[PDB]
Amino acid sequence: DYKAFDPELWNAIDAEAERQQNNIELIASENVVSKAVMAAQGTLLTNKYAEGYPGKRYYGGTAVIDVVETLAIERAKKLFGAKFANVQPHSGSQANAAVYMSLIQPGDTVMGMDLPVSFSGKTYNFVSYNVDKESELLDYDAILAQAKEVRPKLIVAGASAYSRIIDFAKFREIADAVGAYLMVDMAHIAGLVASGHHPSPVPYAHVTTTTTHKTLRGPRGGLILTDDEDIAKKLNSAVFPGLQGGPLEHVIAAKAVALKEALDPAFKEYGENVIKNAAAMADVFNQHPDFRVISGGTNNHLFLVDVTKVVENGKVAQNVLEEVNITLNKNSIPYEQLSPFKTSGIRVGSPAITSRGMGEAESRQIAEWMVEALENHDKPEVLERIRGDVKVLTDAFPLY
């Protein structure tokens, strides 16, 4: 009965389990992990610190830990079709940083989308590309022309708010045309890569990185993939001892569990439902005349909506929707005119509601509420009614 020793803490945990149950989570980077992933991170593997890699540990006592890590490695390789995997990065940003350390020098130019900078932002010269102004799509010819001016040593593809399929073969063609490495950060789409709904970057990127959380639905953490053995060896040294000490083996256990879950046929259905639910919500905004969806829609788990014909800015929209138990985030839109603190947009995502079992009917309802709530932002008695309706829905879809 450990909970009796510390009630303030353990009651706050029940309060969060309750809050999550009454919230509609549309933050596009969020998800809902399995009990098995949680339990894996809650094991006594946290007691064992195991510097180095399997079969090449500094300290002894690591034969079992080597089995666990090898499982995560093999499942990652299998799931994403790569020859080399490193499951030790503590986060997606550590994973990226290792790639920078292994391929380019301090001071080199890196081009990336809509700026994957994190703590590396002062070590390298990051230069941003985004989308064409009219189509709001990637324009590979403009990106090539930009890369010919800037001459990056490394190009990064991947973004946290682009709704459309990325053509990784074209990124690699661009990279090869100016002699740059390609890295892809698939953090946001990794689960859709794993489900088959997004084309894989693995055959085209020199190195691919990802978080294990987000669409892949695992624990917080990183992963790096490559087909090139000389690069693998640099990556492994950059992660340890370059950036990190010993790995979090209990989190690696949880990566294993999540990777197995993503190898299951059922994960393909989840990814289909993610695609469908996002599409359904985007359709509600597309139909309405006072909301515009960026690029006109989505082929992935998210979209951006320009809300400025109905409320002043994306920050206001986020606050209003919090009133009705719906969380999401404000988000700059392409060629954003407003202030980075205000923005003209919101970003809406489907993975978390999909993981609690909601389908297209529910998704469409949720977006009706959003429209309604936003249209009546100044009418607290309306907000309260939507809130009541939201509660009926959350009650019908238990979180665990």
**Helix, strand or coil, per DSSP, at residue 195:** helix
Cβ proximity to its own copies: between 122 and 381 the closer is 122
How far is it, in rounded angstroms, from Cα 190 to Cα 115? 20
Q: SS3 for 286-299, per residue?
A: HHCCCCEEHHHCCC
Between residue 261 and residue 300, which ones bind Na ion under the rule CB under 5 A? Answer: 286, 288, 291
Pick the catalytic residue: 153, 214, 255, 356? 214
339 among the known binding-site residues?
A: yes
Residues 24-83 that bind ligand CAC (CB under 6 A): 29, 49
Interface with ligand CAC (CB under 6 A), residue total 3
- 49 classed as catalytic: yes
- Minimum distance, C-beta of residue 124 to its own copies, in the bound complex (Å): 7
Judged by CB under 6 A, does residue 332 bind ligand CAC? no
Residue 125 binds: one of its own copies, Na ion, ligand CAC, none (C-beta under 5 to 8 A by kind): its own copies
Q: d(Cα 324, Cα 369) in Å, to the nearest integer? A: 9
The verdict on whether residue 338 carries a ligand-binding annotation is: no
Mark out the alpha helices in the chain (DSSP H runs).
Answer: 2-5, 7-22, 35-41, 63-80, 92-103, 140-150, 168-178, 190-195, 229-237, 249-263, 265-287, 314-323, 351-355, 360-375, 380-396
CB of 59 to ligand CAC, least distance (A): 8
Which among its own copies, Na ion, ligand CAC, none contacts residue 364 (Cβ within 5 to 8 A by kind)? none
Residue number with CB closer to ligand CAC (125 or 160): 160
Residue 160 contacts which entry, Na ion, ligand CAC, its own copies, none (Cβ below 5-8 A, type-dependent): ligand CAC
Q: Determine the size of the site formed for Na ion (CB under 5 A).
A: 3
Cβ closer to its own copies: 62 or 200?
62
Give the span between the Cα atoms of 389 and 387, in whole angstroms: 5
Query: In terms of CB distance, is 219 or 271 closer to its own copies?
Result: 219
Q: Figure out which of the listed residues 20, 21, 120, 160 binds ligand CAC, where binding follows CB under 6 A.
A: 160
Q: Residue 149 Cβ, how far from ligand CAC at the closest point, in Å?
A: 28
- Minimum Å gap between C-beta 151 and ligand CAC is 28
Tokens at residue 38, please? 């949680």
Residue number with CB closer to ligand CAC (226 or 355): 355
Contacts of 196 (CB under 8 A, 6+ apart): 268, 271
Please report whether residue 91 would count as binding ligand CAC according to CB under 6 A.
no
Q: What is the chain's percent helix, strand, coil content, to nearest 5? A: 50, 15, 35
What is the rounded distance in angstroms from the CA atom of residue 27 to the CA atom of residue 271?
17
- Residue 341 among known ligand-binding residues: yes
- Judged by beta carbon, residue 245 or residue 388, the one nearer its own copies is 245
Q: Is 185 a catalytic residue?
A: yes
Q: How far is CA 291 from the centre of its chain?
A: 25
The answer to whether the annotation marks 115 as part of a ligand binding site is yes
Residues 195-254 that bind ligand CAC (CB under 6 A): none
Contact assessment for residue 351 and residue 30, using Cβ atoms and an 8 Å cutoff: yes
Q: CA dist 106 to 71, 100, 103, 123, Å? A: 34, 9, 10, 5
CA Rg value for the chain? 22
**354 with 277: CB under 8 angstroms?**
yes
Q: Which residues are catalytic?
A: 49, 51, 185, 211, 214, 220
Binding residues for (6S)-5,6,7,8-tetrahydrofolate: 115, 339-341
Q: Which residues bind Na ion (CB under 5 A)?
A: 286, 288, 291
